Design an enzyme around this catalytic site. Structure first.
Site, PDB file in Angstrom:
ATOM      1  N   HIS A  43       0.768  -1.198   0.053  1.00 33.47           N
ATOM      2  CA  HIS A  43       0.007   0.096   0.097  1.00 33.47           C
ATOM      3  C   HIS A  43       0.903   1.193   0.121  1.00 33.47           C
ATOM      4  CE1 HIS A  43      -0.210  -0.568   4.588  1.00 33.47           C
ATOM      5  NE2 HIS A  43       0.160   1.100   4.438  1.00 33.47           N
ATOM      6  N   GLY A 148       2.185   5.327  10.550  1.00 37.80           N
ATOM      7  CA  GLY A 148       3.636   5.410   9.916  1.00 37.80           C
ATOM      8  C   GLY A 148       4.291   4.230  10.668  1.00 37.80           C
ATOM      9  N   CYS A 150       3.450   0.958   9.614  1.00 38.27           N
ATOM     10  CA  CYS A 150       3.479  -0.130   8.489  1.00 38.27           C
ATOM     11  C   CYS A 150       4.830  -0.401   7.992  1.00 38.27           C
ATOM     12  CB  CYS A 150       2.577   0.134   7.547  1.00 38.27           C
ATOM     13  SG  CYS A 150       0.612  -0.016   8.042  1.00 38.27           S
TER      14      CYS A 150
END
Ligand SMILES: *[C@H](O)[C@H](C[C@@H]1CCNC1=O)NC(=O)[C@H](CC(C)C)NC(=O)OC[C@@H]1CCC(=O)N1Cc1cccc(Cl)c1
Ligand SMILES: *[C@H](O)[C@H](C[C@@H]1CCNC1=O)NC(=O)[C@H](CC(C)C)NC(=O)OC[C@@H]1CCC(=O)N1Cc1cccc(Cl)c1
Ligand SMILES: [Mg+2]
Ligand SMILES: [Mg+2]
Lengths: 305, 305
Positions: A43, A148, A150
């Site tokens: 993503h 933030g 991920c």
């Protein structure tokens, strides 16, 4: 009387040396740099206006090697040139032109419900904290992750070999978290899209409750132990009706049974009784069953195995 | 609903690179190598037949530089030649002929009751796990340490600076642990001798209970909040009779009050009521007050401060 149990993570240094920041357009998150590969959530390619229904195949084909910026910040700083890119399930595999000189010995594995692993929480490619969780029966973890985070990674260690098992992706409505294994599959039935999703029921992890009851006995706390026994088969039928996982014994549990002289089936009976209420008593300072410690945790932390 | 709180330790890599094994005669334990100094517990000098009443002054004078072996095992292996030795309280300061090339920016500080710190548990100079604890009001910690763990270190971090605050020394009869600060003083009234010792009463850390109640509110759990208030002065008189620490507010607590709109004094009143019983209700999955999370933990982990 303190039980001697804590939430114990692996030392994180070997994994810290593998964390990088990955940026694609307006999106930035963390990646894991091993050999000439950087893994990160796919993503990172998605603009905010498409997070609810991304077309990842089209996003992938829209990329060039120029689309990705990879940076290592701490210890041995470096900007890493991306020379290829590919998608594996919910992860990107970026090929970079420098092999990480601090790549540890490693494998990729999937973690199962009830098993513990260590997480290195990172923001902007910088490690900020470490903690340990057990994979829940519904394929979430009870973590601590903010925007933030991920691409933060979870792992176990066997000797010097790091077994990477989790890359962080999302937070569910009940405050729990999930992510992907390094084969690119999400844990559970989850999808890496910004939509509300069915979360399966959680359950008590019976094997871990048994472990904790053994830890209690190893600390001299055994008021709940009686001659009464429930067989594994009978307990498992009960578990299905009472939101417990079915119990599967292991060598680690057997070691606790041998050390304490208390049979598994005695503790299966105790669980059935304790689930109805502790009658005002405490076990290791708790008035409810604890399932966040594994048989291995008890063997290592208390028995020094 | 998971609160988003976990026991969060600092990443340990910078400290891992400072751990060594120290051997003196038949005794071995861990040390901390910073610049040209190795710190370790002084009981490494003590033979097992004297651990109950060591004469550390005589043991020190009986040593030569040849009495100590220092080894680093992981990452950058090395045998370190000891070229001087000195005793500071309950610690030895060994001077070695090589400066640790991986010495981080550091300070030494003492930790106060209620404050959290990270521990790197080590055996034979090899880091094996990391965990976080709060210093208890009676100057023990609820750790996880076995034979061979002495010299394991505890620390906090401010930016890139490591503040070393604890070096592990002993286990008390109730299963808790204590150690020394790097000025060589033991925490509390403890002595580094293998004799049973008076352990002071523990208390609930009121400021941390307040923090946890704020964490509950930040998760939408506020059934215990009423218009009623207890002043800090009045709460503190109550605390002395009820095994709570006296409450001292901080900027970190004030930030939680501003964010939630719930005054400290409302939560002091709630604590007094909750201490008498939760009336079958739960707060963040618990039926008892929780004091193992600090105001800073809540600010960082939930509010991302
Ligand atoms: C990556 O850094 C973050 C980590 C999150 C941020 C807060 N804490 C975390 O752990 N991941 C995300 O922001 C994901 C990205 C998608 C593309 C996977 N989004 C996310 O977790 O939010 C959406 C989640 C998905 C399940 C769910 O119930 N969600 C809430 C939701 C649902 C529908 C619409 C909206 Cl706006 C939110
Ligand atoms: C250093 O590696 C160990 C760490 C211990 C071992 C088990 N878990 C730990 O955390 N430290 C020790 O073995 C110390 C050494 C002395 C010289 C400081 N000894 C220790 O902790 O045991 C004695 C303790 C002291 C307080 C107490 O109540 N103790 C029990 C005790 C008292 C009197 C006699 C005996 Cl044999 C034990
Ligand atoms: Mg949350
Ligand atoms: Mg113990």
């Amino acid at each position: 009387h303190h039980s001697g149990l804590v939430k114990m993570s692996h030392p994180s240094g070997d994994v810290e040396a593998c964390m990088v920041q990955v940026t694609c357009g307006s999106m930035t998150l963390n990646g894991l740099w091993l050999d000439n590969t950087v893994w990160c959530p796919r993503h990172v390619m998605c603009p905010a206006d498409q997070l609810s229904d991304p077309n990842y195949d089209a996003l992938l084909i829209s990329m060039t090697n120029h689309s990705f910026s990879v940076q290592k910040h701490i210890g041995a700083p470096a900007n890493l040139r991306v020379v290829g890119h590919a998608m594996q399930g919910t992860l990107l595999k970026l090929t970079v032109d420098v092999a990480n000189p601090s790549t540890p010995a490693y494998t990729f594995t999937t973690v199962k419900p009830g098993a513990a692993f260590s997480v290195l929480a990172c923001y902007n490619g910088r490690p900020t904290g470490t903690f340990t969780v057990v994979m829940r029966p519904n394929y979430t973890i009870k973590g601590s992750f903010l925007c933030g985070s991920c691409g933060s990674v979870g792992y176990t260690k066997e000797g010097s070999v790091i077994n990477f098992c989790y890359m962080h992706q999302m937070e569910l409505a009940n405050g729990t978290h999930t992510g992907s294994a390094f084969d690119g599959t999400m844990y559970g039935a989850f999808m890496d899209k910004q939509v509300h999703q069915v979360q399966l029921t959680d359950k008590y992890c019976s094997v871990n409750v048994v472990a904790w009851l053994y830890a209690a006995i190893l600390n001299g706390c055994a008021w709940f132990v009686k001659p009464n026994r429930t067989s594994v088969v009978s307990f498992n039928e009960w578990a299905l009706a009472n939101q417990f996982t079915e119990f599967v014994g292991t060598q680690s549990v057997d070691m606790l049974a041998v050390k304490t002289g208390v049979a598994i089936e005695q503790l299966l009976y105790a669980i059935q009784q304790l689930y109805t209420g502790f009658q005002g008593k405490q076990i290791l300072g708790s008035t409810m069953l604890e399932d966040e410690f594994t048989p291995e945790d008890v063997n290592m932390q208390i028995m020094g195995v």
